[PDB]
Amino acid sequence: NLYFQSMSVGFIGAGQLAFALAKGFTAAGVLAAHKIMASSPDMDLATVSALRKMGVKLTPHNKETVQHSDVLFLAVKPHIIPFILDEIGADIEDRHIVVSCAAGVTISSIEKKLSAFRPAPRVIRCMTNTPVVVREGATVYATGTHAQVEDGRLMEQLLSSVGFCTEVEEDLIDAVTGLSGSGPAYAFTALDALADGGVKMGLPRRLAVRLGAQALLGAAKMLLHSEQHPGQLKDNVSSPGGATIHALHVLESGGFRSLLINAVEASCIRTRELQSMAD
Amino acid sequence: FQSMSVGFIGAGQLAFALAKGFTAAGVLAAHKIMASSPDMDLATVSALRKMGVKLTPHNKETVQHSDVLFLAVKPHIIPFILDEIGADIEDRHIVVSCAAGVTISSIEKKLSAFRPAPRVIRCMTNTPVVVREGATVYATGTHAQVEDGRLMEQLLSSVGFCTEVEEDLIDAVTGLSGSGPAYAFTALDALADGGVKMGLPRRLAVRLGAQALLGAAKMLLHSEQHPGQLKDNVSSPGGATIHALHVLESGGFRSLLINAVEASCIRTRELQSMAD
Amino acid sequence: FQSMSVGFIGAGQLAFALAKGFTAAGVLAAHKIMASSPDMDLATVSALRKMGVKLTPHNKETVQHSDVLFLAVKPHIIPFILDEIGADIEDRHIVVSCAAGVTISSIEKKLSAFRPAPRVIRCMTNTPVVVREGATVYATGTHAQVEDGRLMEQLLSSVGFCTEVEEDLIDAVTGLSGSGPAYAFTALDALADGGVKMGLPRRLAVRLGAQALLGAAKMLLHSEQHPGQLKDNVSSPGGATIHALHVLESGGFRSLLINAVEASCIRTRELQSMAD
Amino acid sequence: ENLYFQSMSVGFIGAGQLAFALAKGFTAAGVLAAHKIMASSPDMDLATVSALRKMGVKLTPHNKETVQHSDVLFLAVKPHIIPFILDEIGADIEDRHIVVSCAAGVTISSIEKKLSAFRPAPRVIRCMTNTPVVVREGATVYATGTHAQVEDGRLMEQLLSSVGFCTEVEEDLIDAVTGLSGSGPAYAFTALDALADGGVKMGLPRRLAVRLGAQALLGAAKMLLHSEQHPGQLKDNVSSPGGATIHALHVLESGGFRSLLINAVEASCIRTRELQSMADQE
Amino acid sequence: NLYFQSMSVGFIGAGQLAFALAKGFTAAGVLAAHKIMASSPDMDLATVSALRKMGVKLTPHNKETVQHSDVLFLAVKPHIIPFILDEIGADIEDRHIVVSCAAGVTISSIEKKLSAFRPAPRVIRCMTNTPVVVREGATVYATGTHAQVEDGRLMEQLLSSVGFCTEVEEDLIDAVTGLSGSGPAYAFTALDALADGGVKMGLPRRLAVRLGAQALLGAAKMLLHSEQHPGQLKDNVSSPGGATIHALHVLESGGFRSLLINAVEASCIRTRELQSMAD
Numbered sequence A, E: 001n002l003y004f005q006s007m008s009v010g011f012i013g014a015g016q017l018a019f020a021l022a023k024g025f026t027a028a029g030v031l032a033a034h035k036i037m038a039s040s041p042d043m044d045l046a047t048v049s050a051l052r053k054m055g056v057k058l059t060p061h062n063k064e065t066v067q068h069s070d071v072l073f074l075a076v077k078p079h080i081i082p083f084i085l086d087e088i089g090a091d092i093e094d095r096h097i098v099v100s101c102a103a104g105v106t107i108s109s110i111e112k113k114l115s116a117f118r119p120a121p122r123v124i125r126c127m128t129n130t131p132v133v134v135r136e137g138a139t140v141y142a143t144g145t146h147a148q149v150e151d152g153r154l155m156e157q158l159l160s161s162v163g164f165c166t167e168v169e170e171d172l173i174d175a176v177t178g179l180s181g182s183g184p185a186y187a188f189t190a191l192d193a194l195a196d197g198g199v200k201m202g203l204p205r206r207l208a209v210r211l212g213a214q215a216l217l218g219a220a221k222m223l224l225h226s227e228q229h230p231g232q233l234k235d236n237v238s239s240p241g242g243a244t245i246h247a248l249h250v251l252e253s254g255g256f257r258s259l260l261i262n263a264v265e266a267s268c269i270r271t272r273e274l275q276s277m278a279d
Numbered sequence B, C: 001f002q003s004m005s006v007g008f009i010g011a012g013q014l015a016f017a018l019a020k021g022f023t024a025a026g027v028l029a030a031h032k033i034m035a036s037s038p039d040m041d042l043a044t045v046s047a048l049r050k051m052g053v054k055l056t057p058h059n060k061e062t063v064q065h066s067d068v069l070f071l072a073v074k075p076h077i078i079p080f081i082l083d084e085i086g087a088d089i090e091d092r093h094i095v096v097s098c099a100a101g102v103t104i105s106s107i108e109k110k111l112s113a114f115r116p117a118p119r120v121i122r123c124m125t126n127t128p129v130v131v132r133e134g135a136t137v138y139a140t141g142t143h144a145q146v147e148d149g150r151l152m153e154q155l156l157s158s159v160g161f162c163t164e165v166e167e168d169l170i171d172a173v174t175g176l177s178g179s180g181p182a183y184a185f186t187a188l189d190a191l192a193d194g195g196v197k198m199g200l201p202r203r204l205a206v207r208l209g210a211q212a213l214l215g216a217a218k219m220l221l222h223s224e225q226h227p228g229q230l231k232d233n234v235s236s237p238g239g240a241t242i243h244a245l246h247v248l249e250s251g252g253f254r255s256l257l258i259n260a261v262e263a264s265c266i267r268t269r270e271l272q273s274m275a276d
Numbered sequence D: 001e002n003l004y005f006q007s008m009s010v011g012f013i014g015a016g017q018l019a020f021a022l023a024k025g026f027t028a029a030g031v032l033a034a035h036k037i038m039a040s041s042p043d044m045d046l047a048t049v050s051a052l053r054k055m056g057v058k059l060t061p062h063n064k065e066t067v068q069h070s071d072v073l074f075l076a077v078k079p080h081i082i083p084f085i086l087d088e089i090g091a092d093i094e095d096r097h098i099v100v101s102c103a104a105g106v107t108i109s110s111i112e113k114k115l116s117a118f119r120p121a122p123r124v125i126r127c128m129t130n131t132p133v134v135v136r137e138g139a140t141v142y143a144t145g146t147h148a149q150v151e152d153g154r155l156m157e158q159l160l161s162s163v164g165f166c167t168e169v170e171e172d173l174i175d176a177v178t179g180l181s182g183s184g185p186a187y188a189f190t191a192l193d194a195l196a197d198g199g200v201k202m203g204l205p206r207r208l209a210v211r212l213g214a215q216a217l218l219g220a221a222k223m224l225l226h227s228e229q230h231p232g233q234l235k236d237n238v239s240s241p242g243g244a245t246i247h248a249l250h251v252l253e254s255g256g257f258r259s260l261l262i263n264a265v266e267a268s269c270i271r272t273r274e275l276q277s278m279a280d281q282e
């Protein structure tokens, strides 16, 4: 029964992540779409057309987003952020909470830009992912220097309505990006391949995609609701001499585990290295 | 345009491909094209003569003939060309650089020492312009007029796909569609070897493999659907195609093509860093 | 021909592709085509209705409507189809099997029990017939008349390449151009991933990669030259393309495509051995 | 013939494998008298020195004697020895000399820099050849230095053409040539040894497998050199559908055969450059 | 100064191998092209058009080749041989020497077919390669049951005019096929790759192809004229610490030698397995 009656939300950027969050927030009922405004340099994006359908207010002008909004999501590419902050810095007021969703972009760099216009900008850095669109996102956030205690509690309330949300120290966020920020792409790749495997063995493609996705969904839910180690749940499904343990062996023979470690590491390192070139 | 005069500095594979595509398209008569080369014995130069293109060993004569000037020389030769003909660039000229990696900044810097406001366009095209199915991107320079970009798009659209991009995308485009045809020629040779291994005559295997690739690419271009969806559409359960897809996956087929785009892009950037 | 009536048993991806190509080509009006399927809710069936193709759940009605009868069902369904409609085959009928691996002998054996001298043609086509760039081979059966092979070649030539082959080549053709589009869709997805990794927007990367493959395939088809010679022509010394070719070679890129043709061909043969 | 009646005196500083291969080739060609060649080495106990002796080549431990004897002076020592050689006999190079460096990686510029401190216009040519000059089937490229006369390049081409293919290139190609045809015979010797092993594994006597593999490679190379055709086209022409040859080509592809030969040319070229960059820093 | 004045040669099959041998024999001067006849089911082959240019007599009918010829080369695909022998078996005379060039096809299978029509067919089995076209072929042959001593000496004289030729026991020929029969294809692949390597390092393609081919030609000639082991010649070119030994290492690291062993083995096994399916 959550609802932020006194809150206006703006998205600078109207891409995949802005659409997912707006759809999540509306589907949760915590915000009405008409209290959400999004701006984009390209008003012909398919995400823009969809936001219009939901009732979200659209404008080409980032300044109008800022003037309309209390909570301002920066949902542009990381290299776009300094240009955004240059453009609207003089429009940031005391009432604004600036929530940066950009991968790698530090609270320090955002506060430094905005402090040139007005001291004490209220900045929160977050890393979320697109499954907020089905209210099963995974979000972490870190509060900036001038964020009030009520600011983070409020953002946790909002982002908890679309998935898991928790506060972290900012120096964990690049690693979170490699795990749950990039995570859904790893899963989509895995589901495409599992479906290909089902088709090879004779399943219709539609059934194979549905079964694979359901298997992944249920296994993740099992882990989330269990106090048990994932290796323990693996043991419970691996019947002696059976089909599952034979398949696990061929995963191990290809170094399956190391590829996923490789992936989290690669996404995290890229995230840091993008920011370091920015700075 | 009709009154438009075009010149090529460099008369190698790319200049021939472009001149052949332009004249096949009808947008340009061969007599309105002139080309120069340090080597007037190249096969590409003899072919251009058969088509009716004017040839010269002197780059200055090509410049004086031309309105649109294509630089189709190797990237390391561009600075030398610019030094040799920079004093001959007029206000009427549009200089279109085709060299991999060579930046608009480096070209404008060289030419601006002879005359300010050089109209410079950078493009990355590929050799299939010779059959009017090229892939071309271009970026306009500091002093390029709006009509200059539209003239370029009109000309290059006649021999394939053409769109304007920001210049910082062009090295990646080089790795993808600039080098792309070579990946496809390698693949077509291998697919033909495979057909021959399984009993097909070579001439038939080459024709079938090439037709298969053309038709698939055309399908994707004419479809709104994802390439994996099209792959799904043609992968019958338990069948031959899905068995073959598996063996490609087992060799990391996808990663090799990603590697290739990356390597070509990185080499393109690296060559320019050595230039500057 | 104009008076020619065509039927499809099976209304999946291949039947739609063929009907769409045939009607786009102009050789066949949609109203002279009829299709049947055990599942009248498939997307392919709804699309065929929009085009104006007649639909039915009863294979017998398709047979009675048709002069040329395409069997576009899965290979394991062919024997069942033949048992169900074998008594409805007339002398006027030409039965064109599209099923991977299914031999003319097995089809003639089934049908000859109902009426002697069935006119049977086996082909291997592919889905790019939907954009009139298919690759098709066919072999004529024991009782196929000379005009039957020329009618088939005329029809299938309207939607792509078509040539007659000896039947023992068809399983290899399946591995090459039958499964070929799927290899190309996989490659185009990966090439797009590569362009995206190097900074390109996805929509642009897909378009450029697909255009690059189309143009290269068209170049080879229009050239008398070897694919390695065309590769040589586009591999500038020390440049980006030759660097990218090396990384493909280092992963055994060529061998993977050979593997794929072989695996699809072998699976095609293996399925038929299980049939018989 | 016309080179013979020029009665050139040739010197080699360095009496190793390349000096012996060139001396053998030149004398077999009839362009030089063995006793009109002089070679020097700090190590007079090398086997190649003993072979040169038997040929009739004059040998001396004194590099100055080789310089004074010579009209054309080949520098055939290893690359790191070249700057010490140029220090030692730089004062003895005369205006009449053509100095031909065969050392991998060593630039004309580095040689002229040393020699220019003595006489002002040293005539320098850089070449990359290979040991098959010994059977007059070498692959040679050369580049002419700042003060090399046009007649010097022509003379060099005439001489080296007597022992194989020879052509002028810009100097910036020579490190790559080194990785390809300078090191190339070693790749072929490795390949011939392995093909012979494969012959032996399948039941052939070693002597026959060596002969047949070598004849196959020789004939294939000659076919290519005499054909206006792409090597892939020649490959297509011999690969019968479904046959033994295309099956063998597949297993070469599956091991990345092509990439290993590219790796080899690259590794030899890069090493050649790396040794020069080390010398030019010092 | 060799010349077979009293010899007519026929080729059944007019493909790559027949053209190479006819061009080799004519270039050697041992046969005039007008004393050579070739037949082919396809008179539009590019090889057929070239044979016509040399002056070789062409006919669609294998029977005419047999009637014209003394020495009859079977230069068709192996699976074509039994059909050829069925077609012309009744036309084989006492004067004919039948030289089969087909990979894998045994003397026993040929003699069995031809003996049904007339006893004591004179059969020689050979394995040659296309470099006979430049008179640098590599040929081995085995004499059949009814071949006279003069028959093999004659075929060795003829085939020696276009390259190396020697008699072997028939059970070596499948292995020879894997080594020198398929050998030139291995070399063409290697030369394409070496040229690619030269181009990568900055050489024009034309120069790289010429240098690579010359290097291979000279090295093979060096080995043929030396009494020394190929490893010894390798040692003579591998200067300590130098460029060549660095390149040899990277060949070894990829298992270069084992790939060539793999190749000879694969071609030999395929050759045997084709014949075993024939029998």
Ligand SMILES: Cc1c(C(=O)O)cccc1N1CCNC1=O
Residues within 6 Å of the ligand: A017, A075, A076, A077, A078, A101, A102, A103, A104, A177, A181, A182
């Ligand atoms: C670019 C990006 C990555 C990436 O680098 O792949 C990963 C997670 C989120 C984001 N997003 C989305 C919107 N703005 C961002 O930074």
Ligand SMILES: Cc1c(C(=O)O)cccc1N1CCNC1=O
Residues within 6 Å of the ligand: B014, B072, B073, B074, B075, B098, B099, B100, B174, B178, B179, C234, C235, C236, C238, C239, C240, C241, C242
């Ligand atoms: C050299 C080159 C590459 C490369 O580096 O492989 C790639 C694409 C285009 C070009 N061209 C063609 C003419 N001038 C260029 O720069």
Ligand SMILES: Cc1c(C(=O)O)cccc1N1CCNC1=O
Residues within 6 Å of the ligand: B234, B235, B236, B238, B239, B240, B241, B242, C014, C072, C073, C074, C075, C098, C099, C100, C174, C178, C179
């Ligand atoms: C099943 C199939 C394969 C395969 O086995 O992957 C390959 C090519 C065509 C076909 N089709 C389509 C319709 N009926 C068939 O047999």
Ligand SMILES: Cc1c(C(=O)O)cccc1N1CCNC1=O
Residues within 6 Å of the ligand: D016, D018, D075, D076, D077, D078, D079, D102, D103, D104, D178, D182, D183, E237, E238, E239, E241, E242, E243, E244, E245
């Ligand atoms: C050392 C060397 C290599 C190598 O580095 O392997 C390659 C080619 C030639 C030479 N030679 C021979 C005499 N002096 C040289 O530099």
Ligand SMILES: Cc1c(C(=O)O)cccc1N1CCNC1=O
Residues within 6 Å of the ligand: D238, D239, D240, D242, D243, D244, D245, D246, E017, E075, E076, E077, E078, E101, E102, E103, E104, E177, E181, E182
């Ligand atoms: C088919 C073939 C192979 C092979 O199987 O690749 C190898 C060597 C020779 C032959 N030839 C040529 C003519 N008739 C033959 O058998």
